[PDB]
């Protein structure tokens, strides 16, 4: 069936092996006009707007140590470099999931003071 990430929570999944160097984010689009390639790549665009979103409020989260919408801008100029790393095609909708290796990501919080 499905792998684990299409419906797992993903605060888990990213614990496995295989995404320990990578921050995550997932989306679906429904398939229309039988379209899967269109879906795909809706869903792939909706994944790292996930994969933003998620990445902002961690580090926010992690500014227990202007901040708000200085974040927000240094994780959009990063989002370029993420990878689509699977795809699963549901009944009628298609699922993506996107990484940005963590390295990157360490990078941003220096900017910010972390």
């Given at each position: 069936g499905a792998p684990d990430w299409v419906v797992?929570?993903?605060?888990?999944?990213?614990?496995?092996?295989?995404?320990?160097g990578v921050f995550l984010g997932r989306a679906?689009?429904?398939?229309?006009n039988n379209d899967?390639?269109?879906?795909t790549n809706q869903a792939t665009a909706?994944?790292?707007?996930?994969?933003?979103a998620n990445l902002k409020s961690t580090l926010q989260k992690d500014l227990?140590?202007?901040?708000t919408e200085k974040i927000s801008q240094l994780?959009?100029?990063?989002?370029?470099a993420s990878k689509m790393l699977a795809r699963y095609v549901g009944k009628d909708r298609v699922?993506?999931?996107?990484?940005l290796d963590k390295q990157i990501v360490d990078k941003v919080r220096e900017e910010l003071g972390m």
């Open positions: 797992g929570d993903l605060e888990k999944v990213a614990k496995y092996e295989k995404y320990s679906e689009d429904l398939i229309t899967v390639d269109y879906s909706k994944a790292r707007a996930n994969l933003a227990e140590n202007t901040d994780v959009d100029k990063e989002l370029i699922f993506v999931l996107v990484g």
